């Protein structure tokens with residue numbers, strides 16, 4: 484089932500989400516399936532559960548980036564190197580900005596069946612994971628913009 488994506492300004496995007504405690508369950512598998520469908524219908528490359536008003540540490544992502552469902556994610560930078568790049572948000576439709584993110588990270592958590600996930604990622608892969616992770620702690624990308632000249636509507640931006 485395709486779910487409604489809530490828009491920036493909804494208080495529910497500002498919450499710090501609790502952990503998933505139903506790994507391996509039918510309930511979690513159906514929510515994840517819904518998230519992939521939803522992300523797919525909106526043409527996203529990532530979607531966090533708070534964006535469909537589900538208060539859980541859960542994201543889906545991938546596109547080149549392997550299709551992944553990640554519960555209880557933890558991230559750690561693998562160096563201090565930052566990189567700028569374009570980001571948009573399905574909860575902020577039409578807009579984009581340039582945002583600095585760690586170029587290199589490791590992320591860990593669990594697949595929806597309960598098996599552990601732990602990966603090194605770089606570049607766009609790493610950026611997507613950082614972006615979704617931010618949702619789980621009630622943070623959106625405008626609060627990370629450094630250069631406001633880059634923030635604007637997709638169809639008009641020239642930077």
Ligand SMILES: O=C(O)C[C@@H](Cc1ccccc1)C(=O)SCC(=O)c1ccccc1
Pocket residue numbers: 526527528529530531534569570571572573574610611614615618
């Ligand atoms: O809205 C989210 O939390 C999903 C989001 C993820 C994202 C894209 C690019 C960089 C970081 C995070 C989107 O998929 S935005 C919608 C979109 O069509 C898009 C934007 C930029 C690049 C590729 C796709």
Ligand code: NI
Pocket residue numbers: 484485520
């Ligand atoms: Ni369907």
Ligand code: NI
Pocket residue numbers: 564
């Ligand atoms: Ni470098």
